[PDB]
Amino acid sequence: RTSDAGYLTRRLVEVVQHIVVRRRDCGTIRGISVSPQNSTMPERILIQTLIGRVLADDIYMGSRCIATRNQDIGVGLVNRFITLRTQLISIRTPFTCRSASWICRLCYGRSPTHGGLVELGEAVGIIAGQSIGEPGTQLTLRTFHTGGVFTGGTAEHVRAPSNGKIQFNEDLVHPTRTRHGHPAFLCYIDLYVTIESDDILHNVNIPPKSFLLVQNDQYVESEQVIAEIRAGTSTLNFKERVR
Amino acid sequence: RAAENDDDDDWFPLDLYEAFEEMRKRNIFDVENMYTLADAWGWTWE
Amino acid sequence: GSPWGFLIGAELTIAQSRISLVNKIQKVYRSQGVQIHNRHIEIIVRQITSKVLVSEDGMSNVFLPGELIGLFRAERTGRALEEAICYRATLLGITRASLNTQSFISEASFQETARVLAKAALRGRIDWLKGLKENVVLGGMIPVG
Amino acid sequence: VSTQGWNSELVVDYRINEDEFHKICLFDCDFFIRKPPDPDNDVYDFREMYVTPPDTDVYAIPKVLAPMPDKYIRCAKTDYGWYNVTEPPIDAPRDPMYKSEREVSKVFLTKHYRNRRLNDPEFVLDFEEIYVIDSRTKSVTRARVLVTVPEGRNRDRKGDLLVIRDNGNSFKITHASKRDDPTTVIEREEWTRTRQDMERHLRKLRDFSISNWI
Amino acid sequence: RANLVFHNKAIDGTAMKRLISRLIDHFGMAYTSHILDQLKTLGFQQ
Amino acid sequence: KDVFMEAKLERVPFLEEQMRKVNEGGGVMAGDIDRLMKSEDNRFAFVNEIAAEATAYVNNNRDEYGHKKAIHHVLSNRMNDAGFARPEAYLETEPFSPGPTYLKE
Amino acid sequence: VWKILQEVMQGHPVLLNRAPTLHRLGIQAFQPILVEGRAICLHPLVCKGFNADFDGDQMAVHVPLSLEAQAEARLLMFSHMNLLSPAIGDPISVPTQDMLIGLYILTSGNRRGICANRYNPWNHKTYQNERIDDTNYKSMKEPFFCNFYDAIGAYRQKRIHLDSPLWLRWQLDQRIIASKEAPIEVHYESLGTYHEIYAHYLIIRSVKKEIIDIYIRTTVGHISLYREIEEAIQGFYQACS
Amino acid sequence: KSDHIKARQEVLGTTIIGGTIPNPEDAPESFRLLVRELRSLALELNHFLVSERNFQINRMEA
Amino acid sequence: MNLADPDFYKIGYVRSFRAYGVEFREGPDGFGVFASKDIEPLRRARMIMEIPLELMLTISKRLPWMFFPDIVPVGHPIFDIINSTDPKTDWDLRLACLLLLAFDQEDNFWQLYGDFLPSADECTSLLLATEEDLLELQDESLELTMREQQHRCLEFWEKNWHSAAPLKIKRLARDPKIFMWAASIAQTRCINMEMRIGALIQDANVLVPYADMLNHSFQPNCFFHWRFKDRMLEVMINPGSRIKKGEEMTVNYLSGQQNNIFMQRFGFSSAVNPWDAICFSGDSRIHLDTFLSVFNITGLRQEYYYNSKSAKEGDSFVDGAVIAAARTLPTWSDRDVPIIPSVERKAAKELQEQCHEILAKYPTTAKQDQQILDATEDGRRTLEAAIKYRLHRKLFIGKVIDALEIYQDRILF
């Protein structure tokens, strides 16, 4: 996994090695415009996409203009956008430059290494290739601490609050057979299974499409699965077929 | 041949929608950049 | 019409390809807790989608069909000329986009050295020494920093 | 526009000069009480009050939840603030690394003992009557202070320590000798609030019923 | 007397990274280099 | 009127030991380079200008450099025209050394 | 000979390069000094910049000869103007494992609740109770140090431990990150005293003037860290004129 | 510090004695070898230095 | 020449303002910036008066209006006043609004810096003068312009402070004489510069505390520079200029434009005015390459020099008046290589005597004469200043006549 990462770095740099910041504003008016109030991007991917970029068109609030053309987006300026509910922000990205053999200072944005406009004659093509090649080995380094056990999906389980006596209405649930081969109870509505824990009356919330694994008036221990929450299977995305 | 997560995220329809503004404010139908193609020199002259 | 129409179509196709590719690249890294700004992704993505391929029945006299001229190269002349320009699209890979470079020296030192050198010699290609690999090969000063 | 109720903030379309009122700055409101002339700004003629959003000219009488005085009472102005210290973003060099602003949420007004003077050698606060100005819901209420002193009604007013508590609700008066130390009060709530968490954490163990030791 | 924040909690790994970023943006990369040398010495001592 | 006049201006004492470790660690030069570059637009042009000035310094008065590190000389010259004493060529001495060489940790 | 090879190296940068180069910060310029032994001593903070451990690794040195090259090495590849990674703009030299543990232990605080007292402090007793306040007055409470340096001095005498709480007078504005909060208990004497007790600080206001009684409950570790940062800044500022 | 036949000797000379190190003009011997075995395959590789002030070709010899 | 109060340097010093070799004085005048110690000639520039961006107002010079030290809150009903202001004509109005706002918002730096600013009884700007004081001025075009300029601000006072006046907008100017103080301050202490904040190069009218105290002199020794990275305004000592131990350090206000009718409008009055003269006409022409030759004045109108290495101290009669009237007069040149005809009947004497007739010892109106100078009555800080302007115009005309007759006398050595 370290050789393939090294090979990808060679190819990433090869495409962009001649890309150098050769000039200031190249005289473009087309700017990629983003909509932060679509509520689609979380305020951690949206924020990381606007910081450093330079604006393409003035941003207004009716009569008041809060950010003009040729004004890079800082840290506190983004907070001024989502709070004020601005729906259109146009920025200058590498996609909007008027050339393919080089790039502009304003069509690139803030330099990520020294907190300012990118300086003339910077090998931004080399920087882009390396920064998307190095990480490639965390897809390895992050795997260089384990073997046989990985990170994937799980399922949801409900455990008893404490020792007690499960009580509920057995009439509203419909008999079933669990994927482990045990009898259980599908509930299609919100039940309220109560546990008489001597002095306490813990109420357990069971959402629909659950798999109650306990009967009425059954003694349960402290921590022990009494009802599945939702669905089942091998706790992952899509189906296969194995013998 | 591929896990079709699909999960349509930022796609757009296969119709004539968004004529004047093609994709947000991307490409307005100019009708001023290219009459001069026939006005500055001869195209409309014939 | 035909001159307007495919200018519109190619520009739309390139835009959609860029939007899809940026998100597709960034999702793999964001699913593993890796943070990289979109500048580095977009710089590569632009080079991946920046050139059109002159489709068949587009002979004319300037662009022979099968040529792989740039996007601006085609859209600036389509606004001026009136033949069958008739390009469609190329989402060139990270390997193929580097073989169609302005400098044959850089390509010759990457892959398929014999083919690149043979074609350049037969054509009589000229390298203007504007990149960074070619100037390193010749021992000359690189034009950066 | 008398001292009536009950839960209606009736609006007023007339601008009223505030150079004869009392400027009581709060978080989400701005209560106004008339200020009769006096040498040292120590009279509060309640009668007419008006509450407005912070720094706004639109006036409206507040909500009265208890009887208010109909005479001239010399009282003192208090506050209940938090001093939010949120840390703002840094844009340029030398930008501030922290913020600070008071968040006054309750303005208690304690009457003087029979409306004495500020400098006379008989200064005692009359803790029996205290009026609470809320900010979350614009309203004025009279406090319900409690006295645990064995002297009761007949006592020396030259020192009867008053204790306020959670969110400006509890009110007690205690002899000034038995004042709690700063550390004891802090340690008291820490002990109580963390003994519940420890008991809550240990409740899930199978042996919680048969246990001991806290 | 500088412009700093008096910490009163546990400065874990993610808090140290945040603090360095804020000291860099407020003072620069020339003042921060000396802070890092001092914090390294104080961290090793305790 | 604003009562913070001296609370924000009280001199921090015990700073004498946090004045020296800057001077042998190269901290003064590092904190002077950025102040010289605080007004420059392109850092590469500044570096090239410094290199050319140092080359001229080596050419005009050859038989002095080899110890003085003429780049340090030009940096000190540029820093010495606006106060900022900055001893010549940032030369370091050994005030207490009845010996040839320090151990250097 | 060594007097010469201690005299021509002062001011001549050298490029250190880690043999398995991975990222842009794998090659960095440095100001060498002569050490005794056979191994190159490297700064620990830049190690993660080199991704270098110390289980046995090799580093190649290079010497720039040209005056222009020396200017490049000194003014463009020194680890004091390359403190941010070009990926997203995050710090590349931050206190790693050992320094991080030291700073965490320093800023760990006291024992908050039941871990500091065996019995409840409600416990109506130990009041020195009688009809008058004339009894034995120990009131150990916590120390009331004037400022930082008093606290460090009292810590040097082993009078108090690192996590032993103390009261420190505050002569500045509000710095500790607070929130909506609530004052737990605000005592009010018949005379204007405004004794307020918050979650972690105490304010003694009045009805006349001079709201200067701000007291902070803290430990010597936080004081030490704040003093370290503050004096580092005020020493770098005055060292560089 | 590599291929230059004539430049290693001159840096040794200007470094024994002291002067301003001059930037080289000719390409290293690696490029000379490259043009040599690209000549063995019946192919050319010619450098040029078209001047910006006279447009006069200044073809280097290799 | 006593130094200022210690509070002057502080309050701003606590907010990162550093002055190295200067010390502002307190004596009754514009506070003034005078140096200490000696600097000796240098190479490029010595930086001084480190002034950060946070202590400014810097309204933009073109639409849209932006204030980088953000003073106006979001939705505050004073941006509507500014956005309704006519651009490109009255930049001193919105600036006055910003200055008034930076007096009642919070503990802003300008809330404290207001005390050191001149008050209504102080200041010399004509916008604070009265009717008969404006009449006391030997000028009618300037009188008309200043009478109109005292209006156009009464008008832009009742359009936004008329009996509705939200208390935010009110309490900033309760009467139309403190708004005049703010307008005069904006006129006197505004400077138009270029500010590179981030990726934005913009032109803006700005107000700079601790820098407006730099007095004026048409022979300057100070530059204004804007450090791009850390956003700081700095004064710079000129290269190759020796500095004494307490003498004046000055930065010019206007250059390449003068005539003493706009500089006087912007404060006080001209003293030497090296770019002003009175149209002569009335005669045919005078020679060009002799007025600058008798005094060894260098040509090249945009840059006129005296060449102090002239002679054995030939005269002490060079001033701004000489260098101004050496280029604003007939000055026939013809082929520029003539015989230099010493025809005193035409090339000299009577022709400038005709100028002596044209300048017939103040023949226009002569409302007053030598009696006016040093009337020994100081008052109101605006009277005796129009009198000062009259004195200085009369002195300029008299010294121009004197220089002309010295020139016409010395054409033969």
PDB file of N, CA and C in Angstrom, chain D residues 77-78 80-85 98 100 103 124-125 127 157 159 161-165 179 181-183 185 187-192 194 213, chain G residues 112-114 117-122 141-142 167 173-181 183-190 194-195 197-198 201-202:
ATOM      1  N   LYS D  77     -30.156  49.869  43.077  1.00  0.00           N
ATOM      2  CA  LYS D  77     -30.225  49.131  41.823  1.00  0.00           C
ATOM      3  C   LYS D  77     -29.146  48.056  41.787  1.00  0.00           C
ATOM      4  N   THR D  78     -29.553  46.824  41.502  1.00  0.00           N
ATOM      5  CA  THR D  78     -28.651  45.683  41.415  1.00  0.00           C
ATOM      6  C   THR D  78     -28.677  45.122  39.993  1.00  0.00           C
ATOM      7  N   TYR D  80     -27.741  41.096  37.638  1.00  0.00           N
ATOM      8  CA  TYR D  80     -27.475  39.654  37.648  1.00  0.00           C
ATOM      9  C   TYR D  80     -26.887  39.306  36.281  1.00  0.00           C
ATOM     10  N   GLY D  81     -25.558  39.310  36.188  1.00  0.00           N
ATOM     11  CA  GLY D  81     -24.892  39.140  34.908  1.00  0.00           C
ATOM     12  C   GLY D  81     -23.931  37.970  34.844  1.00  0.00           C
ATOM     13  N   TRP D  82     -23.555  37.562  33.629  1.00  0.00           N
ATOM     14  CA  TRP D  82     -22.735  36.373  33.433  1.00  0.00           C
ATOM     15  C   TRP D  82     -21.344  36.642  32.882  1.00  0.00           C
ATOM     16  N   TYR D  83     -21.148  37.713  32.107  1.00  0.00           N
ATOM     17  CA  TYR D  83     -19.866  38.001  31.457  1.00  0.00           C
ATOM     18  C   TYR D  83     -19.454  36.866  30.512  1.00  0.00           C
ATOM     19  N   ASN D  84     -20.216  36.737  29.426  1.00  0.00           N
ATOM     20  CA  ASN D  84     -19.851  35.810  28.360  1.00  0.00           C
ATOM     21  C   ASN D  84     -18.459  36.129  27.821  1.00  0.00           C
ATOM     22  N   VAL D  85     -17.625  35.095  27.679  1.00  0.00           N
ATOM     23  CA  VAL D  85     -16.228  35.270  27.280  1.00  0.00           C
ATOM     24  C   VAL D  85     -15.934  34.475  26.010  1.00  0.00           C
ATOM     25  N   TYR D  98     -10.320  37.228  22.505  1.00  0.00           N
ATOM     26  CA  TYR D  98     -11.473  36.898  23.329  1.00  0.00           C
ATOM     27  C   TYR D  98     -12.442  38.070  23.311  1.00  0.00           C
ATOM     28  N   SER D 100     -16.053  39.861  25.490  1.00  0.00           N
ATOM     29  CA  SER D 100     -16.622  40.033  26.821  1.00  0.00           C
ATOM     30  C   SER D 100     -17.755  41.044  26.748  1.00  0.00           C
ATOM     31  N   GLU D 103     -24.339  40.295  30.538  1.00  0.00           N
ATOM     32  CA  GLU D 103     -25.632  39.742  30.153  1.00  0.00           C
ATOM     33  C   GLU D 103     -26.613  39.851  31.310  1.00  0.00           C
ATOM     34  N   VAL D 124     -28.998  51.479  56.245  1.00  0.00           N
ATOM     35  CA  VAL D 124     -29.409  50.079  56.297  1.00  0.00           C
ATOM     36  C   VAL D 124     -30.351  49.821  55.131  1.00  0.00           C
ATOM     37  N   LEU D 125     -30.097  48.751  54.381  1.00  0.00           N
ATOM     38  CA  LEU D 125     -31.030  48.331  53.346  1.00  0.00           C
ATOM     39  C   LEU D 125     -32.233  47.645  53.975  1.00  0.00           C
ATOM     40  N   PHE D 127     -34.431  44.926  53.401  1.00  0.00           N
ATOM     41  CA  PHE D 127     -34.470  43.729  52.575  1.00  0.00           C
ATOM     42  C   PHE D 127     -35.855  43.107  52.482  1.00  0.00           C
ATOM     43  N   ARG D 157     -31.505  45.833  62.402  1.00  0.00           N
ATOM     44  CA  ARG D 157     -31.351  45.857  60.955  1.00  0.00           C
ATOM     45  C   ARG D 157     -29.930  46.181  60.519  1.00  0.00           C
ATOM     46  N   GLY D 159     -27.229  44.856  59.815  1.00  0.00           N
ATOM     47  CA  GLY D 159     -26.583  43.624  59.417  1.00  0.00           C
ATOM     48  C   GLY D 159     -27.477  42.409  59.539  1.00  0.00           C
ATOM     49  N   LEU D 161     -27.589  39.376  56.800  1.00  0.00           N
ATOM     50  CA  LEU D 161     -27.082  38.948  55.505  1.00  0.00           C
ATOM     51  C   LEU D 161     -28.180  38.289  54.681  1.00  0.00           C
ATOM     52  N   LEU D 162     -28.291  38.704  53.423  1.00  0.00           N
ATOM     53  CA  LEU D 162     -29.294  38.194  52.499  1.00  0.00           C
ATOM     54  C   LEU D 162     -28.628  37.244  51.517  1.00  0.00           C
ATOM     55  N   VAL D 163     -29.263  36.102  51.279  1.00  0.00           N
ATOM     56  CA  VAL D 163     -28.735  35.078  50.389  1.00  0.00           C
ATOM     57  C   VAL D 163     -29.693  34.929  49.219  1.00  0.00           C
ATOM     58  N   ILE D 164     -29.175  35.097  48.009  1.00  0.00           N
ATOM     59  CA  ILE D 164     -29.917  34.796  46.801  1.00  0.00           C
ATOM     60  C   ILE D 164     -29.351  33.506  46.226  1.00  0.00           C
ATOM     61  N   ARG D 165     -30.126  32.863  45.362  1.00  0.00           N
ATOM     62  CA  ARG D 165     -29.830  31.505  44.925  1.00  0.00           C
ATOM     63  C   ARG D 165     -30.280  31.360  43.476  1.00  0.00           C
ATOM     64  N   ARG D 179     -22.228  33.786  57.818  1.00  0.00           N
ATOM     65  CA  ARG D 179     -22.054  33.899  56.378  1.00  0.00           C
ATOM     66  C   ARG D 179     -21.149  32.782  55.881  1.00  0.00           C
ATOM     67  N   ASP D 181     -18.479  30.675  53.688  1.00  0.00           N
ATOM     68  CA  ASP D 181     -17.209  30.968  53.048  1.00  0.00           C
ATOM     69  C   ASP D 181     -17.329  30.802  51.533  1.00  0.00           C
ATOM     70  N   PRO D 182     -16.517  31.531  50.759  1.00  0.00           N
ATOM     71  CA  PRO D 182     -16.555  31.346  49.298  1.00  0.00           C
ATOM     72  C   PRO D 182     -16.268  29.922  48.862  1.00  0.00           C
ATOM     73  N   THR D 183     -15.335  29.242  49.530  1.00  0.00           N
ATOM     74  CA  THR D 183     -14.995  27.881  49.131  1.00  0.00           C
ATOM     75  C   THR D 183     -16.106  26.903  49.484  1.00  0.00           C
ATOM     76  N   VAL D 185     -19.392  27.292  49.593  1.00  0.00           N
ATOM     77  CA  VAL D 185     -20.507  27.338  48.650  1.00  0.00           C
ATOM     78  C   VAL D 185     -20.146  26.608  47.363  1.00  0.00           C
ATOM     79  N   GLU D 187     -17.808  24.270  46.967  1.00  0.00           N
ATOM     80  CA  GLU D 187     -17.663  22.850  47.261  1.00  0.00           C
ATOM     81  C   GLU D 187     -19.007  22.189  47.533  1.00  0.00           C
ATOM     82  N   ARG D 188     -19.991  22.956  48.007  1.00  0.00           N
ATOM     83  CA  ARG D 188     -21.297  22.384  48.319  1.00  0.00           C
ATOM     84  C   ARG D 188     -22.006  21.899  47.060  1.00  0.00           C
ATOM     85  N   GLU D 189     -22.088  22.751  46.036  1.00  0.00           N
ATOM     86  CA  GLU D 189     -22.772  22.357  44.809  1.00  0.00           C
ATOM     87  C   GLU D 189     -21.979  21.305  44.046  1.00  0.00           C
ATOM     88  N   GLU D 190     -20.649  21.379  44.099  1.00  0.00           N
ATOM     89  CA  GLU D 190     -19.834  20.357  43.451  1.00  0.00           C
ATOM     90  C   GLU D 190     -20.074  18.991  44.076  1.00  0.00           C
ATOM     91  N   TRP D 191     -20.145  18.932  45.408  1.00  0.00           N
ATOM     92  CA  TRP D 191     -20.385  17.660  46.079  1.00  0.00           C
ATOM     93  C   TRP D 191     -21.760  17.105  45.735  1.00  0.00           C
ATOM     94  N   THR D 192     -22.785  17.959  45.750  1.00  0.00           N
ATOM     95  CA  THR D 192     -24.143  17.493  45.484  1.00  0.00           C
ATOM     96  C   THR D 192     -24.318  17.077  44.028  1.00  0.00           C
ATOM     97  N   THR D 194     -22.076  16.108  41.814  1.00  0.00           N
ATOM     98  CA  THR D 194     -21.266  14.972  41.397  1.00  0.00           C
ATOM     99  C   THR D 194     -21.612  13.692  42.141  1.00  0.00           C
ATOM    100  N   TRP D 213     -21.754   2.968  50.785  1.00  0.00           N
ATOM    101  CA  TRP D 213     -20.536   3.769  50.688  1.00  0.00           C
ATOM    102  C   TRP D 213     -20.552   5.075  49.902  1.00  0.00           C
TER     103      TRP D 213
ATOM    104  N   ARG G 112     -12.654  17.806  41.807  1.00  0.00           N
ATOM    105  CA  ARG G 112     -13.844  18.646  41.893  1.00  0.00           C
ATOM    106  C   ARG G 112     -14.745  18.351  43.088  1.00  0.00           C
ATOM    107  N   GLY G 113     -15.328  17.156  43.142  1.00  0.00           N
ATOM    108  CA  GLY G 113     -16.401  16.911  44.087  1.00  0.00           C
ATOM    109  C   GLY G 113     -16.125  15.888  45.168  1.00  0.00           C
ATOM    110  N   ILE G 114     -16.789  14.733  45.075  1.00  0.00           N
ATOM    111  CA  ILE G 114     -16.652  13.681  46.069  1.00  0.00           C
ATOM    112  C   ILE G 114     -15.251  13.096  46.107  1.00  0.00           C
ATOM    113  N   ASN G 117     -13.571  15.414  48.996  1.00  0.00           N
ATOM    114  CA  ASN G 117     -14.103  15.365  50.349  1.00  0.00           C
ATOM    115  C   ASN G 117     -14.783  14.026  50.573  1.00  0.00           C
ATOM    116  N   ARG G 118     -14.480  13.393  51.707  1.00  0.00           N
ATOM    117  CA  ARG G 118     -15.131  12.129  52.034  1.00  0.00           C
ATOM    118  C   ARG G 118     -16.584  12.345  52.440  1.00  0.00           C
ATOM    119  N   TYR G 119     -16.851  13.385  53.222  1.00  0.00           N
ATOM    120  CA  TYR G 119     -18.182  13.669  53.731  1.00  0.00           C
ATOM    121  C   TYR G 119     -18.752  14.914  53.066  1.00  0.00           C
ATOM    122  N   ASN G 120     -20.076  15.011  53.090  1.00  0.00           N
ATOM    123  CA  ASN G 120     -20.755  16.148  52.493  1.00  0.00           C
ATOM    124  C   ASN G 120     -20.363  17.431  53.222  1.00  0.00           C
ATOM    125  N   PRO G 121     -20.166  18.539  52.504  1.00  0.00           N
ATOM    126  CA  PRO G 121     -19.916  19.824  53.169  1.00  0.00           C
ATOM    127  C   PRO G 121     -21.167  20.532  53.671  1.00  0.00           C
ATOM    128  N   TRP G 122     -22.365  19.984  53.459  1.00  0.00           N
ATOM    129  CA  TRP G 122     -23.549  20.537  54.110  1.00  0.00           C
ATOM    130  C   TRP G 122     -23.427  20.380  55.621  1.00  0.00           C
ATOM    131  N   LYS G 141      -9.319  27.118  54.478  1.00  0.00           N
ATOM    132  CA  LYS G 141      -9.798  27.658  53.199  1.00  0.00           C
ATOM    133  C   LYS G 141      -8.738  27.378  52.133  1.00  0.00           C
ATOM    134  N   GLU G 142      -8.327  28.365  51.350  1.00  0.00           N
ATOM    135  CA  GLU G 142      -7.297  28.222  50.337  1.00  0.00           C
ATOM    136  C   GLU G 142      -6.442  29.478  50.348  1.00  0.00           C
ATOM    137  N   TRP G 167      -6.772  30.859  45.633  1.00  0.00           N
ATOM    138  CA  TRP G 167      -7.422  32.078  45.172  1.00  0.00           C
ATOM    139  C   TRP G 167      -6.365  33.056  44.685  1.00  0.00           C
ATOM    140  N   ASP G 173      -9.216  42.170  32.690  1.00  0.00           N
ATOM    141  CA  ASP G 173     -10.588  41.928  32.278  1.00  0.00           C
ATOM    142  C   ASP G 173     -10.873  40.428  32.348  1.00  0.00           C
ATOM    143  N   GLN G 174     -12.028  40.010  31.841  1.00  0.00           N
ATOM    144  CA  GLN G 174     -12.413  38.605  31.885  1.00  0.00           C
ATOM    145  C   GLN G 174     -11.715  37.848  30.763  1.00  0.00           C
ATOM    146  N   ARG G 175     -10.964  36.815  31.125  1.00  0.00           N
ATOM    147  CA  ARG G 175     -10.229  36.005  30.162  1.00  0.00           C
ATOM    148  C   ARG G 175     -10.690  34.559  30.116  1.00  0.00           C
ATOM    149  N   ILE G 176     -11.053  33.977  31.258  1.00  0.00           N
ATOM    150  CA  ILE G 176     -11.459  32.577  31.292  1.00  0.00           C
ATOM    151  C   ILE G 176     -12.771  32.411  30.542  1.00  0.00           C
ATOM    152  N   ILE G 177     -12.824  31.414  29.662  1.00  0.00           N
ATOM    153  CA  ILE G 177     -13.980  31.209  28.795  1.00  0.00           C
ATOM    154  C   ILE G 177     -15.172  30.808  29.659  1.00  0.00           C
ATOM    155  N   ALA G 178     -16.150  31.700  29.766  1.00  0.00           N
ATOM    156  CA  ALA G 178     -17.403  31.441  30.456  1.00  0.00           C
ATOM    157  C   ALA G 178     -18.540  31.391  29.440  1.00  0.00           C
ATOM    158  N   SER G 179     -19.754  31.224  29.946  1.00  0.00           N
ATOM    159  CA  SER G 179     -20.923  31.032  29.096  1.00  0.00           C
ATOM    160  C   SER G 179     -22.128  31.631  29.810  1.00  0.00           C
ATOM    161  N   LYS G 180     -23.330  31.226  29.387  1.00  0.00           N
ATOM    162  CA  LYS G 180     -24.557  31.749  29.980  1.00  0.00           C
ATOM    163  C   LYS G 180     -24.525  31.631  31.498  1.00  0.00           C
ATOM    164  N   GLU G 181     -24.083  30.481  32.008  1.00  0.00           N
ATOM    165  CA  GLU G 181     -23.691  30.343  33.407  1.00  0.00           C
ATOM    166  C   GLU G 181     -24.802  30.700  34.390  1.00  0.00           C
ATOM    167  N   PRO G 183     -24.629  32.524  38.754  1.00  0.00           N
ATOM    168  CA  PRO G 183     -23.950  32.632  40.054  1.00  0.00           C
ATOM    169  C   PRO G 183     -24.633  31.732  41.071  1.00  0.00           C
ATOM    170  N   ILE G 184     -23.855  30.824  41.660  1.00  0.00           N
ATOM    171  CA  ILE G 184     -24.425  29.823  42.558  1.00  0.00           C
ATOM    172  C   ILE G 184     -25.056  30.485  43.774  1.00  0.00           C
ATOM    173  N   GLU G 185     -24.364  31.454  44.365  1.00  0.00           N
ATOM    174  CA  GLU G 185     -24.812  32.047  45.622  1.00  0.00           C
ATOM    175  C   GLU G 185     -24.232  33.446  45.724  1.00  0.00           C
ATOM    176  N   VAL G 186     -25.096  34.450  45.787  1.00  0.00           N
ATOM    177  CA  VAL G 186     -24.670  35.835  45.939  1.00  0.00           C
ATOM    178  C   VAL G 186     -25.159  36.328  47.297  1.00  0.00           C
ATOM    179  N   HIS G 187     -24.229  36.467  48.238  1.00  0.00           N
ATOM    180  CA  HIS G 187     -24.550  36.998  49.553  1.00  0.00           C
ATOM    181  C   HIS G 187     -24.679  38.515  49.493  1.00  0.00           C
ATOM    182  N   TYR G 188     -25.571  39.052  50.320  1.00  0.00           N
ATOM    183  CA  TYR G 188     -25.832  40.489  50.346  1.00  0.00           C
ATOM    184  C   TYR G 188     -26.023  40.924  51.791  1.00  0.00           C
ATOM    185  N   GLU G 189     -25.053  41.661  52.325  1.00  0.00           N
ATOM    186  CA  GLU G 189     -25.184  42.209  53.665  1.00  0.00           C
ATOM    187  C   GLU G 189     -26.181  43.365  53.669  1.00  0.00           C
ATOM    188  N   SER G 190     -26.607  43.753  54.875  1.00  0.00           N
ATOM    189  CA  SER G 190     -27.504  44.899  54.997  1.00  0.00           C
ATOM    190  C   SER G 190     -26.863  46.164  54.443  1.00  0.00           C
ATOM    191  N   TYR G 194     -22.553  43.105  47.966  1.00  0.00           N
ATOM    192  CA  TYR G 194     -22.647  42.442  46.664  1.00  0.00           C
ATOM    193  C   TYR G 194     -21.747  41.211  46.582  1.00  0.00           C
ATOM    194  N   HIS G 195     -21.699  40.431  47.658  1.00  0.00           N
ATOM    195  CA  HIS G 195     -20.845  39.249  47.655  1.00  0.00           C
ATOM    196  C   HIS G 195     -21.386  38.197  46.698  1.00  0.00           C
ATOM    197  N   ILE G 197     -20.741  34.784  44.290  1.00  0.00           N
ATOM    198  CA  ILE G 197     -19.917  33.592  44.133  1.00  0.00           C
ATOM    199  C   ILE G 197     -20.392  32.865  42.886  1.00  0.00           C
ATOM    200  N   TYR G 198     -19.549  32.832  41.863  1.00  0.00           N
ATOM    201  CA  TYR G 198     -19.870  32.160  40.616  1.00  0.00           C
ATOM    202  C   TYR G 198     -19.337  30.730  40.655  1.00  0.00           C
ATOM    203  N   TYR G 201     -15.274  31.864  40.034  1.00  0.00           N
ATOM    204  CA  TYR G 201     -14.672  33.119  40.458  1.00  0.00           C
ATOM    205  C   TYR G 201     -15.639  33.878  41.353  1.00  0.00           C
ATOM    206  N   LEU G 202     -15.071  34.778  42.150  1.00  0.00           N
ATOM    207  CA  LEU G 202     -15.803  35.542  43.149  1.00  0.00           C
ATOM    208  C   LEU G 202     -15.656  37.031  42.873  1.00  0.00           C
TER     209      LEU G 202
END
